[PDB]
Amino acid sequence: AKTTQEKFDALKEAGVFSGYPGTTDAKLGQDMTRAEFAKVLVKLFGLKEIHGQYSYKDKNYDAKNWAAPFIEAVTAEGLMQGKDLTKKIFDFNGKITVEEASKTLVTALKLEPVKDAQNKATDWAKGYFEAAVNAGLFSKDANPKANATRAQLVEAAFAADEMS
Numbered sequence: 001a002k003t004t005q006e007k008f009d010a011l012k013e014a015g016v017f018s019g020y021p022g023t024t025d026a027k028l029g030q031d032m033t034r035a036e037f038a039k040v041l042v043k044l045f046g047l048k049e050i051h052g053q054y055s056y057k058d059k060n061y062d063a064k065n066w067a068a069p070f071i072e073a074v075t076a077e078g079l080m081q082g083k084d085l086t087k088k089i090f091d092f093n094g095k096i097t098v099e100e101a102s103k104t105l106v107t108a109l110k111l112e113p114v115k116d117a118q119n120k121a122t123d124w125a126k127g128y129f130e131a132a133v134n135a136g137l138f139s140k141d142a143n144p145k146a147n148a149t150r151a152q153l154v155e156a157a158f159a160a161d162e163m164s
């Protein structure tokens with residue numbers, strides 16, 4: 001079985017994840033913004049980027065924001081809808097959590113949420129986290145509410161790619 005690092009290298013060659021300048025360190029212990037994760041989802045699932053459209057009101061969510069085409073693409077695909085509908089806030093600088101990642105991947109893979117699922121996830125997410133655990137995207141001992149580490153995102157993305 002491939003290590004996290006070998007899984008990363010594969011995803012990177014494929015354009016789905018990136019490294020950092022001037023180092024081979026993949027920084028598997030660090031976190032990831034929701035903007036970057038939207039981009040991961042686009043590259044992982046082969047989605048079309050949507051230019052010149054803005055469905056959120058966050059400060060600096062505009063045409064100069066490199067993430068908008070990715071954010072719009074995952075929004076149009078129904079994978080993500082942001083954090084509150086009435087102010088139209090996506091939170092692109094906020095970090096992706098393991099339960100949030102679970103929802104997007106389970107949805108994209110067309111897997112079904114677990115009903116009556118019992119776990120430590122926020123109420124809205126319990127079914128998606130559990131489904132994700134069952135499909136081997138995250139380990140059952142991951143904290144649904146924590147920022148997902150890049151290592152966790154790599155293992156999820158890799159597993160997701162294998163399933164798709």
Ligand SMILES: CO[C@@H]1O[C@@H]2CO[C@](C)(C(=O)O)O[C@H]2[C@H](O[C@@H]2O[C@H](CO)[C@@H](O)[C@H](O)[C@H]2NC(C)=O)[C@@H]1NC(C)=O
Nearest residue numbers: 079080081082083084085090099100101103104124125
């Ligand atoms: C703090 O609120 C959450 O923010 C999450 C941010 O990340 C995602 C994956 C996103 O879409 O960007 O999920 C957001 C949460 O959205 C909730 O997603 C559920 C999963 O499908 C939906 O069933 C719920 O309708 C949605 N809202 C609530 C209140 O649970 C939920 N957002 C909202 C608007 O309720």
